[PDB]
Amino acid sequence: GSYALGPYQISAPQLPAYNGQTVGTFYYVNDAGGLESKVFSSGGPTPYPNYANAGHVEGQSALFMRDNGISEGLVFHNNPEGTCGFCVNMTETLLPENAKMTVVPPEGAIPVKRGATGETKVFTGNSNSPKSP
């Protein structure tokens, strides 16, 4: 299971075993067309603590895209209960307009909270921006 990210074909990197804090690798393409990655973990402070997902792996991925003018990104996280409902419903607001970001939970993720998803999701950013707290 590899995923397209511009010209590159990327499959899941090895990740820590999940212990209650989500960990993930974000991949993106810089202005030169080169491949870059960042590691994010959940639980930190954030500039938008009013959004429950801002400090998540996928939320930091989204806010990094906003702050760096990135338009296409791919994130792998290790949470076995999938991508949460906060992220399903708020991630296009953090994303800058029209930016595309694909979130890949671990294989065989099984959600336990309604609204959460165990499937890969492709968010494309909408026009609204985070409100400041």
Partner: protein, 120 residues
């Protein structure tokens, strides 16, 4: 009605069970509740609770709202193994105010009119 917390999902049929359920604090003196009538989870009330305080979200397709209390951050827990989240102190509402909100959502299946809301 579907009701999710740290320990999993049960179905709630009347308000008194709901009120008992929202009092559960299985770990870190905390809980994370998801109340929904839909199999897809939308609309939902999504509640973070710790000690006698809470933060309440209401979510629907194209709709995102958070409770408005009276500011730094306050740490809540998302799961039983201790995954943490930092939330706005501006959104922290009383544990009681949260019960009244959950009561209204149970009877109306729509955004509770009790709390003050900010739209996200």
């Amino acid at each position: 009605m579907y009701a999710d917390d740290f320990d999993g999902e049960i179905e709630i049929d009347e308000v008194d069970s709901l009120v008992e359920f929202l009092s559960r604090r299985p770990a870190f003196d905390a809980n994370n509740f998801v109340l929904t009538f839909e199999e897809s989870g939308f609309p939902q009330l999504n509640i973070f609770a710790k000690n006698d305080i809470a933060v309440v979200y209401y979510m629907d397709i194209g709709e995102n709202f958070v409770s408005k209390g009276n500011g730094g951050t306050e740490k809540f827990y998302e799961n039983k193994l201790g995954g943490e989240v930092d939330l706005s102190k501006d959104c922290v509402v009383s544990k009681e105010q949260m019960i009244e909100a959950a009561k209204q959502f149970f009877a109306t299946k729509q955004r509770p009119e009790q709390l003050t809301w900010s739209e996200l």
